Homo-oligomer: A and B are copies of this chain.
Amino acid sequence: KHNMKAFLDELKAENIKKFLYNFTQIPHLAGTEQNFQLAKQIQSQWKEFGLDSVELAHYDVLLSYPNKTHPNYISIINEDGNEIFNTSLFEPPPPGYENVSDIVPPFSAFSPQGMPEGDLVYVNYARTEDFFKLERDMKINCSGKIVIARYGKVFRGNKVKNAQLAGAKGVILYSDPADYFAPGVKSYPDGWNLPGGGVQRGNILNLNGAGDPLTPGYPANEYAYRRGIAEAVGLPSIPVHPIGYYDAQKLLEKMGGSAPPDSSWRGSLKVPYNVGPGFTGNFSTQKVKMHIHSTNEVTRIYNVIGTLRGAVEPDRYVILGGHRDSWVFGGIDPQSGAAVVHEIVRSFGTLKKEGWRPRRTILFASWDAEEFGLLGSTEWAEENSRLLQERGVAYINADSSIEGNYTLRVDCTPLMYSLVHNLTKELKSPDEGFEGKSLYESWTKKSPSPEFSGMPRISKLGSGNDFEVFFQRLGIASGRARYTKNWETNKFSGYPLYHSVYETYELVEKFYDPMFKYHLTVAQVRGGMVFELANSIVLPFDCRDYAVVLRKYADKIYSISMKHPQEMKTYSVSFDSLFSAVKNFTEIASKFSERLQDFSNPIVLRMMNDQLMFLERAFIDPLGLPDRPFYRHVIYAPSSHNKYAGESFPGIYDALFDIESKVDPSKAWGEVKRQIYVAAFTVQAAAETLSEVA
């Protein structure tokens, strides 16, 4: 038989291992020849595997690279202008790779050029609340200063945005061992920790969903009109560069001015973590000088798009996508994901060669330039938005399959909660001590829901990966799943070797997953989800799960507002409409579920499948969120303080944030009321898509 068990049984850990080795021997940086060659290899192999069509979709997008003959570095400079200490020009390469060429040195992609010189201020994680503490409580002014911030907690582009608005003239990002060195584990190559010379690459854009900075709204095809660089979307205005903790120690050790305000500001280095500005007495005349010479360049990128045509509903698309470009070798990010996608394609293709096809069309994507701002997925979605609008059932992302070996991590739309619970109850746990137990059992034990007993945690979607355009712009039901660590406070910081040269095949094979059993489990989860979405007669979405969360989110946003009772009285701020809409959605969803269970009629079925498919779509507002036109989902958006985190009722949340500091409370509370109206209307309008159609 050709059922899900047949699909799942065909997946093999040893194939995932072979693919991971094959994809990680040389760097695959976006825009480079190496990565184009890998695209062509994947295209050829997906064809061999049995897909109906496999094409490359190319775009010409703005990328950023260091200047090979004018390298980036930071100095401490004396009053005579002598550079007395310099940060490293490259990470010491790992054993056996010291002769690999074209390893891009650490840099912050899209930094502007400059050579700012100044006094340092230390800003902890450079979060919104860290700058509030500095400027409001400690009365420290960052204007004209170079800020030094530790990586962790929030997306680095948010740090840079925050520093820019505080008036900084430059930002130095570093990896503190508090966040990137687990106690009792050795540094690479002897363990999975970051060494003092390791550095985390990554872009510092704030694109808010736009994709290529030069072509917002439209694909960057051959005839595209491009914005001038001065009008580009999302580019930082001050130079930025990342460094390792050996170099950070040298910059932080001489810091003077004010003591850290409390222990949450101190990392694990042997320095005081003084906030500054500037250095202690003896070194008061020394400064820090940055030298950044990176260039932004329009560069061709290539997505591979494979199609497995549906037997019954070929005009309904289930998409499994993940990226292929990496900063260096991509041992975890992304090739641990890409190897899983490759084995999933091979398995579906095996069934296809035996005469099977899925009910609905499955599209498989190998995206390019994810590391430079989700560029490949977003340009392709811009090109194909009308097809995706009207035909897109679901998107499952497939970046890194592992970031630890402890338990499952899942973020997805509520419409997928029941699917994930049911699938994980049918899969074997790979965990020590849970032999013979379901993955649902191990996951629920290790990562309990904060809300419900005997349920696992599933988080909201924000941004930070290639599902963003599908979910936040287009309103296609999306999900993601991987294996993770037990390090809760580090959930947005990345594993220690994230975006470093040290993330290699050997890292994964020696220290993360020697038997590739966690990779196999992730392949079963991602592939099983795609299988069910593409083959179930009724789409496997439960609208009642959205009703449950909407009440949760309404209670939460009401509780934030209720911190300001006198203003709610003064400005007549009522959440009554939003609770009414949620109540209506709950009632209508319950009645729809009854009809769905109670309805031989393929028109009623498809009518009902269309209601299920367009339900996520109903939460899209074609006017977008305030000043973020490409974030259009009214229930979820990436947090304005941390792109990696999802925020619920984002338009209301942002209207309320720090509202006590707004100079015109009438205007500010008016906009809260406006956002309550938009949210109440949108929830009611989504509910009504589930009513009887006539």
Contact = CB atoms under 8 A, between A and B. Distances in A.
B361 A685 contact: no
B681 A221 contact: yes
A636 B481 CA distance: 44
Interface stretch (A8-16, A175-183, A617-625): A617-625
Interface in A607-625: 607, 610-611, 614, 617-618, 621-623
**Which one of A217, A310, A315, A576 has the highest number of Cβ atoms from chain B below 10 Å of its Cβ?**
A315
Contacts of A607: 313-315
Contact of A617 (B307, B390, B614): B390
B390 A694 contact: no
Interface string A585-621: 0000000000000000011001100110010011001
Interface in A635-694: 670, 673-674, 676-678, 680-681, 685-686, 688-689, 693-694
Contact of A309 (B223, B611, B694): B694
Given A314-B607, A607-B315, A685-B386, A629 B618 contact: no
Interface residues of A, number: 53
B686 A577 contact: no
Interface in A423-475: none
A391 interface: yes
Interface string A526-537: 000000000000
Contacts of A224: 677, 681
Nearest to A576: B223
Contacts of A386: 614, 617-618, 685-686, 688-689
B693 A225 contact: no
Nearest to A622: B622
Contacts of A219: 681
A509 interface: no
A678 B221 CA distance: 11
Given A314-B607, A386-B618, A223 B577 contact: yes
Interface in A549-564: none
Nearest to A632: B622
A225 to B, nearest CB: 4
Interface string A60-81: 0000000000000000000000
A694 B314 contact: yes
A387 interface: yes
Given A693-B314, A693-B391, A383 B603 contact: no
Contacts of A610: 315, 390
A2 B598 CA distance: 32
A286 B314 CA distance: 77
A619 to B, nearest CB: 9
A623 B629 contact: yes
A211 to B, nearest CB: 13
Given A315-B607, A622-B622, A677-B225, A694 B614 contact: no
A312 interface: yes
A365 to B, nearest CB: 14
5 contacts: A52-B694, A225-B677, A384-B688, A386-B688, A390-B390
Which 5 pairs of residues, A with B, have the shortest CB-CB distance?
Answer: A315-B693, A223-B577, A309-B694, A225-B677, A361-B694
